[PDB]
RNA sequence: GUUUGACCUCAAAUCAGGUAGGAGUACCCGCUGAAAAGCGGAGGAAAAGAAACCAACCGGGAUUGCCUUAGUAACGGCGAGUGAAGCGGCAAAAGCUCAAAUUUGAAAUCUGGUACGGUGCCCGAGUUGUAAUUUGGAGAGGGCAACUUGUAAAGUGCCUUCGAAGAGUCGAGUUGUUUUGCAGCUCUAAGUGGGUGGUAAAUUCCAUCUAAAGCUAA
């Protein structure tokens, strides 16, 4: 599958091609708001290994944050904005000297596709509501420093 | 028990990384390091590489990789 | 500055594929 | 509007700044007639729609219905193939006697490797222009890739000659200008 | 005497019966009671006289006597130079051990490292291996049960010395335990370094028993199989034997030709030895048949006076081929014409032929008279899964046999164009094989 | 309660001491002639990250599994 | 062809269906924080949770809580005094799911509407990948052998070939904070790699896991 090639092309970020894509996409997002929706993940490999599935009930938001942690705060922004959505996880996509750009994956527990497909029904439970608020996300656990 | 991650580098992997580094090009510090090699020798090349990096083993790795680039480019 | 990119490794052509996956049964029998 | 302004501002800065030579391999694409005959070739190898699939399925299920049913063996289907990871999968075998790569993909990094991959593998790849038209010939909105492996004898000569043609028009013409930095002129 | 009177386990008796051997060869008769006595020994025997069975029976007797579990130890080690002989020995031993309770495996240069690594992790009670890969196994594999060494064998020491692996067995035997190990070895001839290795190996004092024009067809690498097919069609109704390298190639070509409906007999190691004897019997009695067999499987038995010797695949020991053709010429009063296929990279072999000083004849190939079946071969391979897999296995074993070849100056895998070999087997594109290139 | 391995203790203060463990191994349950997955449905604990390194502990827990198999009657 | 149509993107809905707030807050989880207060978020519990673990043994084996370890180790104008953890006994015990190679001999996936949770038909979503199978304890492909539970699904013995994994991350410099960790700025790797920890009769050895993703009752 092609997603490997995405992974190892992403591995070389400061290379000419990906720095060019960084520098065009940073500007293009700069024209856009602080928070807004993306039609598709710009790093689909990262989204999958963080748990993305391309079907109804998976929402992509691009969040802009000024330079707690920046990733956690960015997650909290969409947490307040999209209360109905539940924050799954986020990842880094782009940055600027003025702002850092992150892509967050949110899941709707109301769409029957998520409510069915018992692989993901677990997020429908009320106990998972606002994981980012309680630091239960990946960055939340990392900042809390919970490991063995 | 030794994890299969431990075993070795598959042919697909060396192929993939060679193809990536080809299509990526050379970074401005790398574009520097090639000229610094060609001009003032591997000693100063290693010094500058280690200053750019943190440790020395990564420095020798980088210098050896870039000598591979220089050799496989100029002669072929 | 800028310089053109060298094609020193693309010019070598491999005569074989990367992976020797054994062909599965289902590709030859009706599904 | 904001987004009309953005999209009109998009494609200006990209040409304003120097695109990497791995890009601008795109938009140095197949000429008019050659794309036209490529699509005429493909339109014989449209994949079966979900609707046609279901019609043949109910037909054959009804054929099994009879007492006095009928049992037969049928040959392989023939169609283009279009899914991205599947397209790369038919590469590294190799099986793609042809691959078409759309130029306009918003995550271009999904496709930047495909030209070099098929170059080194020797698959006769071509950069088609417009993912939507690939979608039209494949019962999809968009495809971004179109690989073909198996071809009937009635088109095999056409396939081979088109392969030589694309080798003449794309690999020969644009390899030296695939080989330079594009863009960089202000707008 | 016979094999069956000697004290043997019932499963070994059944295996011997189903492989059909009742009598023994005289030298094997001399060596067997020594093998039961447990003394070390060196021996001179002709290649393929049944000496493989001669050690397989008493080693399995030892495993009857000890009854140790697969995890407890590995026991018997077998060292054989070439991949072909190792595979033939494995195929001979597979049934003998299938009636018996212990475990078998292969350790060969060119096979997947991970398969054999996992097998060594599980443990193998009868190891059969080539000299080169055993060092890697003993130095790299962890937890491999090695301390036992109930016994060990070397086969045809002259050939390993010719290959140049003497350092490797010195290193191994330094790694090997000795007090539990008992060494038997077989080598038709001997040299001083072979005797040195024997002195290091044989723990007690051993008692030993000691008892022309050629065609060359320079055919380019792809049309050689099809040229064989055409030449075979033209010389139908003449009994002909073809020498290959890999048993897989023999098998695949056999049913390939059977599908094209020309009668063929197959004689390769993987077959059961009774089907082997039967096939040789119908070949000898019919007097008009195509036979496809490996170099060493042919070596192990005498050849009836034949219309054509062809060697399709490269030889294993070219010196033995020169002597074999000499003996065939002086033995078969009926003229047996011998020819070898070649590849344009192989012309060095011809100068080696000039070193043999025997005369040589060029047999020309007309580009007009071509079967033109390659498209049909491609369509068949695309159609049938079974022929697909068998062609792939034969091709894979062909390249692995090239990897195991000794004389590199005459055969370099780099010289060979692999797309074109793949076309020879009927693949447009080479299937990948893990081979060091 | 689920049946458990009798296991050897670590350290030197209790090097002489024997304990109740978590699970046997895959290798040991295979030596029992049954599978770990099916052995779960019977109420036998299984631990995969553990390794068997002592012969006597292994043999004792094997005989323990034999007597467990003997005393159990399973309903279809 | 100045036409028409494929997409992409964006708007607008008194279009259809849902969802967020607020109160309380004894317990729980994050942020902030003085000489606790405050903020944010639930639930009946919550959190954590199946080793990039602990150890050096004759090794142990998710997490959680109690006794002990123990007022010991360690820390501290080594002053005030601060203050653990392995292991062991006990309670209760639970293991699982992704992401990496193709189904390509047929997206096999699913929301919604409609006629009778299900079934049909139709819109759609989706190949920039929904299904099945595989999470390293391996697993996959076939073939042979038997078994055991509509050319149905699953388990085991043997031969051969294959056998794919978390990067602005690891790490390094510096600044602030904290008692080693955390946060910011410059830099940024490798794959028989990497991390951690012992070890010399030292051009050393072997020891132990696999991060940069996720769920899980008691």
Swiss-Prot record, chain B:
The keyword Repeat does not apply. One of its GO terms (molecular function) is RNA binding. It is found in: Cytoplasm. Coiled coil: none annotated. N-terminally acetylated by acetyltransferase NatA. GO terms for cellular component: cytosol; cytosolic large ribosomal subunit. GO terms for biological process: cytoplasmic translation. It comes from the Eukaryota. Keywords: Acetylation, Cytoplasm, Ribonucleoprotein, Ribosomal protein. Belongs to the eukaryotic ribosomal protein eL36 family. Component of the large ribosomal subunit (LSU). Mature yeast ribosomes consist of a small (40S) and a large (60S) subunit. The 40S small subunit contains 1 molecule of ribosomal RNA (18S rRNA) and 33 different proteins (encoded by 57 genes). The large 60S subunit contains 3 rRNA molecules (25S, 5.8S and 5S rRNA) and 46 different proteins (encoded by 81 genes). Component of the ribosome, a large ribonucleoprotein complex responsible for the synthesis of proteins in the cell. The small ribosomal subunit (SSU) binds messenger RNAs (mRNAs) and translates the encoded message by selecting cognate aminoacyl-transfer RNA (tRNA) molecules. The large subunit (LSU) contains the ribosomal catalytic site termed the peptidyl transferase center (PTC), which catalyzes the formation of peptide bonds, thereby polymerizing the amino acids delivered by tRNAs into a polypeptide chain. Present with 31600 molecules/cell in log phase SD medium. This is Large ribosomal subunit protein eL36A.
Curated annotation (Swiss-Prot), chain C:
Present with 2680 molecules/cell in log phase SD medium. Component of the NOP7 complex, which is required for maturation of the 25S and 5.8S ribosomal RNAs and formation of the 60S ribosome. It is found in: Nucleus, Nucleolus; Nucleus, Nucleoplasm. Belongs to the WD repeat BOP1/ERB1 family. It comes from Saccharomyces cerevisiae (strain ATCC 204508 / S288c). Component of the NOP7 complex, composed of ERB1, NOP7 and YTM1. The complex is held together by ERB1, which interacts with NOP7 via its N-terminal domain and with YTM1 via a high-affinity interaction between the seven-bladed beta-propeller domains of the 2 proteins. The NOP7 complex associates with the 66S pre-ribosome. Also interacts with NOG1. This is Ribosome biogenesis protein ERB1. The chain holds residues 239 to 269 of 807 of the full protein.
From Swiss-Prot, chain E:
Its EC number is 3.6.4.13. The keyword Nucleotide-binding applies. It is found in: Nucleus, Nucleolus. Changing residue 51 to A: Lethal in vivo and impairs ATPase with 2-5% of wild-type ATPase activity, a 20-fold higher KM for ATP and prevents RNA/DNA heteroduplexes unwinding activity in vitro. GO terms for cellular component: 90S preribosome; nuclear envelope; nucleolus; preribosome, large subunit precursor; small-subunit processome. Keywords: ATP-binding, Helicase, Hydrolase, Nucleotide-binding, Nucleus, Phosphoprotein, Ribosome biogenesis, RNA-binding, rRNA processing. It catalyses: ATP + H2O = ADP + phosphate + H(+). Interacts with RRP1. Associates in the nucleolus with the 60S and pre-60S ribosomal subunits. It has also been isolated with the nuclear pore complex. ATP-dependent RNA helicase involved in 40S ribosomal subunit biogenesis. Required for the processing and cleavage of 35S pre-rRNA at sites A0, A1, and A2, leading to mature 18S rRNA. Transcription depends partially on SET1. PANTHER family: RNA HELICASE (PTHR24031). This is ATP-dependent RNA helicase HAS1. It comes from Saccharomyces cerevisiae (strain ATCC 204508 / S288c) (Baker's yeast). The gene is HAS1.
Swiss-Prot record, chain F:
It is found in: Cytoplasm. Component of the large ribosomal subunit (LSU). Mature yeast ribosomes consist of a small (40S) and a large (60S) subunit. The 40S small subunit contains 1 molecule of ribosomal RNA (18S rRNA) and 33 different proteins (encoded by 57 genes). The large 60S subunit contains 3 rRNA molecules (25S, 5.8S and 5S rRNA) and 46 different proteins (encoded by 81 genes). Present with 133000 molecules/cell in log phase SD medium. Component of the ribosome, a large ribonucleoprotein complex responsible for the synthesis of proteins in the cell. The small ribosomal subunit (SSU) binds messenger RNAs (mRNAs) and translates the encoded message by selecting cognate aminoacyl-transfer RNA (tRNA) molecules. The large subunit (LSU) contains the ribosomal catalytic site termed the peptidyl transferase center (PTC), which catalyzes the formation of peptide bonds, thereby polymerizing the amino acids delivered by tRNAs into a polypeptide chain. Belongs to the eukaryotic ribosomal protein eL13 family. This is Large ribosomal subunit protein eL13A. The lineage of its organism: Eukaryota, Fungi, Dikarya, Ascomycota, Saccharomycotina. The chain holds residues 52 to 127 of 199 of the full protein.
């Amino acid at each position: 599958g092609a997603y490997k090639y995405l992974e190892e092309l992403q591995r070389k970020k400061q290379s000419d091609v990906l720095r060019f894509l960084q520098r065009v996409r940073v500007w293009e997002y700069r024209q856009k708001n602080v928070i807004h929706r993306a039609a598709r993940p710009t790093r689909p490999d990262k989204a999958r290994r963080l748990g993305y599935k391309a079907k109804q009930g998976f929402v992509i938001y691009r969040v802009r944050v000024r330079r707690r942690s920046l990733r956690a705060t960015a997650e909290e922004r969409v947490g307040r904005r999209a209360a109905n959505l539940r924050v799954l996880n986020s990842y880094w996509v782009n940055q600027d000297s003025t702002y850092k750009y992150f892509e967050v994956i949110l899941v709707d527990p109301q769409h029957k596709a998520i409510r069915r497909d018992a692989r993901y029904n677990w997020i429908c439970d009320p106990v998972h509501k606002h994981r980012e608020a309680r630091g239960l996300t990946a960055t939340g656990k990392k900042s809390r420093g919970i490991n063995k | 028990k030794i994890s299969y991650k431990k075993g070795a580098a598959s042919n697909r992997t060396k192929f993939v990384r060679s193809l990536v580094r080809e299509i990526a090009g050379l970074s401005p510090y790398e574009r520097r390091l090639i000229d610094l090699i060609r001009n003032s020798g591997e000693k100063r090349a290693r010094k500058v590489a280690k200053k750019r990096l943190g440790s020395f083993t990564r420095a020798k790795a980088k210098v050896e990789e870039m000598n591979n680039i220089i050799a496989a480019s100029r002669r072929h | 500055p800028y310089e053109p990119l060298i094609d020193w490794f693309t010019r070598h052509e491999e005569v074989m594929p990367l992976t020797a996956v054994p062909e599965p049964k289902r590709r030859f029998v009706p599904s | 509007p904001e987004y009309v302004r953005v999209q009109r501002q998009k494609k200006i800065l990209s040409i304003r700044l120097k695109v990497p030579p791995t890009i601008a391999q795109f938009q140095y694409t197949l000429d008019r007639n050659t794309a036209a005959e490529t699509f005429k070739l493909f339109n014989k190898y449209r994949p079966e729609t979900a609707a046609e699939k279901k019609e043949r399925l109910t037909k054959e299920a009804a054929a099994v219905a009879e007492g006095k049913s009928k049992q037969d063996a049928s040959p392989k289907p023939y169609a283009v193939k279009y899914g991205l990871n599947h397209v790369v999968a038919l590469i590294e075998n190799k099986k793609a006697k042809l691959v078409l790569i759309a130029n306009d993909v918003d995550p271009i990094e999904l496709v930047v490797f495909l030209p070099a991959l098929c170059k080194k593998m020797g698959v006769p790849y071509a950069i088609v222009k417009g993912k939507a038209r690939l979608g039209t010939l494949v019962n999809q909105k968009t495809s971004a890739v179109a690989a073909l492996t198996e071809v009937r004898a009635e088109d095999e000569a056409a396939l081979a000659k088109l392969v030589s043609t694309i080798d003449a028009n794309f690999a020969d013409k644009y390899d030296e200008v695939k080989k330079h930095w594009g863009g960089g002129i202000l707008g | 005497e016979k094999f069956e009177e000697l004290k043997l386990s019932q499963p070994t008796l059944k295996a011997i019966e189903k492989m059909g051997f009742t009598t023994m060869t005289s030298v094997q008769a001399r060596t067997i009671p020594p093998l039961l006595a447990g003394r070390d020994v060196l021996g001179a025997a002709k290649t393929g006289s049944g000496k493989t069975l001669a050690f397989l029976i008493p080693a399995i007797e030892l495993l009857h006597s000890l009854k140790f579990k697969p995890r407890n130890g590995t026991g018997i080690i077998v060292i054989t130079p070439t991949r072909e002989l190792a595979l033939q020995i494995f195929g001979v031993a597979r049934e003998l051990m299938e009636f018996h309770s212990q475990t078998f495996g292969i350790v060969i240069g060119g096979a997947n490292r991970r398969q054999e690594a996992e097998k060594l992790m599980k443990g193998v009670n009868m190891l059969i291996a080539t000299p080169g890969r055993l060092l890697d196994h003993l130095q790299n594999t962890k937890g491999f049960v090695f301390k036992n060494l109930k016994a060990l064998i070397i086969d045809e020491a002259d050939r390993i010395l010719e290959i140049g692996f003497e350092d490797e067995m010195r290193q191994i035997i330094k790694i090997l335990p000795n007090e539990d190990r008992q060494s038997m070895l077989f080598s038709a001839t001997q040299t001083t370094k072979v005797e040195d290795l024997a002195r290091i190996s044989l723990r007690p004092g051993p008692l030993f028993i000691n008892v022309l024009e050629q065609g060359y067809v320079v055919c380019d690498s792809d049309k050689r199989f099809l040229l064989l097919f055409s030449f075979l069609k033209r010389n139908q109704k003449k009994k002909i034997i073809v020498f290959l390298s890999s048993c897989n190639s023999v098998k695949y070509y056999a049913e390939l030709l059977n599908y094209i409906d020309l009668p063929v007999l197959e004689l390769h190691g993987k077959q059961k030895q009774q089907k082997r004897t039967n096939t040789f019997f119908e070949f000898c009695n019919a007097e008009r048949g195509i036979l496809i067999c490996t170099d060493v499987a042919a070596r192990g038995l005498d050849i009836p006076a034949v219309d054509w010797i062809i060697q399709f695949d490269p030889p294993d020991d070219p010196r033995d081929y020169i002597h074999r053709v000499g003996r065939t010429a002086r033995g078969t009063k009926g003229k047996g014409k011998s020819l070898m296929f070649l590849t344009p990279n192989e012309l060095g072999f011809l100068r080696y032929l000039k070193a043999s000083k025997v005369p040589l004849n060029e047999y020309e190939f007309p580009e007009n008279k071509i079967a033109n079946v390659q498209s049909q071969l491609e369509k068949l391979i695309k159609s049938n899964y079974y022929l697909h897999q068998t062609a792939k296995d034969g091709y894979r074993s062909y390249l692995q046999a090239y990897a195991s070849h000794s004389l590199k100056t005459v055969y370099q895998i780099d010289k060979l164009d692999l797309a074109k070999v793949a076309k020879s087997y009927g693949f447009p594109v080479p299937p990948k094989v893990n081979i060091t290139i | 309660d689920l049946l458990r391995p009798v296991v050897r203790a670590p350290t030197v203060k209790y090097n002489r001491k024997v304990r109740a463990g978590r699970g046997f191994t895959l290798a040991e349950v295979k030596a029992a002639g049954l599978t770990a997955a099916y052995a779960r449905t019977i109420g036998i604990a299984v631990d995969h990250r553990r390794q068997n390194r002592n012969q006597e502990i292994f043999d004792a827990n094997v005989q323990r599994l034999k007597e467990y198999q003997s005393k159990i009657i399973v309903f279809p």
